[PDB]
Amino acid sequence: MLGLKTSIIGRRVIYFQEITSTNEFAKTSYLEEGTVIVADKQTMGHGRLNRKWESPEGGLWLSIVLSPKVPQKDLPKIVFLGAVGVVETLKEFSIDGRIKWPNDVLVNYKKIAGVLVEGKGDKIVLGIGLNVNNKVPNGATSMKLELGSEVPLLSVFRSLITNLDRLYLNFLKNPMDILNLVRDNMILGVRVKILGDGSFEGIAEDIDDFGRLIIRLDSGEVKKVIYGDVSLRFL
């Protein structure tokens, strides 16, 4: 009844009225690649750095099960697929979202979506949380708040899954393709504070072929930031 016409992602969709975390269900479960897990609300939603992710009724909280057959050196680019997909969908609904390295999607610097990619063996779980009609913490925003009107959840879901399937199909063919889309939708050219192994500032210049963020230190020297236990803040 959902009417999806995708090739890999969304061939099957499992919906729960309530769940602890769609990412956790994807990890403890054995499901076919492309299967989408979605819930009206999550009681224990979480983000990167393992922080709480508010998941009230009205938002889009989903997880996608994947087993990407691509070189291990390319797998890290998977986190960008989710962010680009959200940006393309936002565009379809007249919203201009930008990517905050490495997984956040902001609108006028307000967080409207987050991406959480987790790995368990050869399985990869791509989790996406997008604010649509739900209330959000102060500082954040939603599609409803941006458009000043509710937006049918199914339509957004349909749009996002369709974009992700296309992006994924291309990813399997050539993992490098996603890079040009990320670069052209990412927030760069501004000064940022990085909290990884230590602490330093600089301009978010660009990301490289591996997906690492290129920071141009004031000393004209550079520092590459890898995805993981890292925090980025705009100064």
Next chain:
Amino acid sequence: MLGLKTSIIGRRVIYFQEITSTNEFAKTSYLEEGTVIVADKQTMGHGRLNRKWESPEGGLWLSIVLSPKVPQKDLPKIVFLGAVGVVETLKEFSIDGRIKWPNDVLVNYKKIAGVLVEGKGDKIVLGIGLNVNNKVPNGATSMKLELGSEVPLLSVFRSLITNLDRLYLNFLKNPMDILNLVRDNMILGVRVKILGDGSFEGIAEDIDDFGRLIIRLDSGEVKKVIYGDVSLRFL
């Protein structure tokens, strides 16, 4: 993201772009009571007498896993649950459907839906096929054909599942209540040809509290038909 608020039926929904039959997946699968299986299309959909059920894109093809804890003598009333739920849903979409004993729903004598209940012990599978926006065989009808425009499948789904959940809870509380709803929406008072173990005609007078159809033969005697390998045709 479907936003169902049901207590039992629809706490979980599994969707497939394509499937052989939702009724077959609902059986051969371990699933919690209330779980709903739905697909855009079925390649091997079938009905009551094992005839093919055309399931193209545009209609609602679903199956519900159930394990009602009620006396075995009231289980046969389960098939009426689906038929009444469809009638109540059609009412909500300004359509006047009536029940053709024991599982069909007609609009001006044209079949708009069929109900197929299958058992496997304690586990019961309630299957429903409702023509919405799909092309239908000659003689049949659909919500689109009745209304003059397409009807959002999700809205019909939400409506049907919500009605089925309410009816099911009342059913577990008192299996007899569904009968008055059936009588009030079933086609009665007309002559029908019955094809069960033999062949006879008569007026479809009413149904008894077991769910058996009361046929009053021309002689003056009445004959009772139980759900099973029986066919009914309006004369």
